[PDB]
């Protein structure tokens, strides 16, 4: 079976490259972040513009939702993270402590903590209520390209240009595993599978890989796209068929069959690098966003 994703909406408004798109867990909203220093909110099902959220002083590279869809955290070049109340648009907290650009961010499932990764080569863990840095992980020896909590928040996976993926025990800070193949290309994205058993990792050699991290083994490899320059998000599409979804530097959205590794769809329309894809939590919907010769978000819908 192959998906039949088809373009439903293009969403425009950001005045510079879009960095990140994320669907709210309750499925009503898409949040977009951009080099133009702005967060924008759109309806998930029609892409209707809802509001702009602002306050960061430099461009934004990531945004993530709290589990209750009430809060957003953003990661900015201004070396801060901001906790936002979506409904009011106010900045609730400014998270300071990184000494270089903040590049990536995520809530834990309970949404009482935020993880961040920075150009300063560290991972930071933040208390959402107080906005205080709980812990700093000297996580890597190069910029941290992604950080992600597992299904219950007890683990953090980070990726870095130093070529490593590291799994951290959230509470103890201990590095439980360091993962690397037989080469060391920069790792530009990583995230746990929904079941927590795997990490999906992008490396800047045009390769995605599915690792059983417990066993420390690569179970699947996905190729055919173009990824050598940008930290492009990748997804497990789970609502219908089990796909792997990623943007690509040839301006396409790639969709692979997770089991077989075959490319099953390529979504055309973007006119620049598709930096970010997101999968709707209940509907077979993909959101994708592109860099500075495009600056738009597209919503794609599939029957399966």
């Amino acid at each position: 079976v192959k998906p039949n994703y088809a373009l439903k909406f293009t969403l425009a408004g950001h005045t510079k490259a879009v960095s990140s798109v994320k669907f709210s867990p309750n499925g009503e909203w898409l949040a977009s972040s951009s080099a133009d220093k702005l967060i924008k909110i759109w309806g998930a099902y029609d892409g209707k513009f809802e509001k702009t959220i602002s306050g960061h002083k430099l461009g934004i590279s990531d945004v993530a939702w709290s589990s209750d869809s009430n809060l957003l955290v953003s990661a900015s070049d201004d070396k801060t993270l901001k906790i936002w109340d979506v409904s009011s648009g106010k900045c609730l907290k400014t998270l300071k402590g990184h000494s270089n650009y903040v590049f990536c961010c995520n809530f834990n499932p309970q949404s009482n903590l935020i993880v961040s990764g920075s150009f300063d080569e560290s991972v930071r863990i933040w208390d959402v209520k107080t906005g205080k840095c709980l812990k700093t992980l000297p996580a890597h020896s190069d910029p941290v390209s992604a950080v992600h909590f597992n299904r219950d928040g007890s683990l953090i996976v980070s990726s870095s240009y130093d070529g490593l993926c590291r799994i951290w025990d959230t509470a103890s800070g201990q590095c439980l595993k360091t993962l690397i193949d037989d080469d060391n290309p920069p790792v530009s994205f990583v995230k746990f599978s929904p079941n927590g058993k795997y990490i999906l990792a992008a490396t800047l050699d045009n390769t995605l890989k599915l690792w059983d991290y417990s066993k420390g083994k690569c179970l699947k490899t996905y190729t055919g796209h173009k990824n050598e320059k940008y930290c492009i998000f990748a997804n497990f599409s789970v609502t219908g068929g089990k796909w792997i979804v990623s943007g690509s530097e040839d301006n396409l959205v790639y969709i692979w069959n997770l089991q077989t590794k075959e490319i099953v769809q390529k979504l055309q329309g973007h006119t620049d690098v598709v930096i970010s894809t997101a999968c709707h939590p209940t509907e077979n919907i993909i959101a994708s966003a592109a860099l500075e010769n495009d600056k738009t978000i597209k919503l794609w819908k599939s029957d399966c």
Binding site: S34, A35, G59, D62, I275, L291
Partner: peptide, 5 residues
């Protein structure tokens, strides 16, 4: 910075 090569 994610938007930069």
């Amino acid at each position: 910075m994610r938007t930069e090569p």
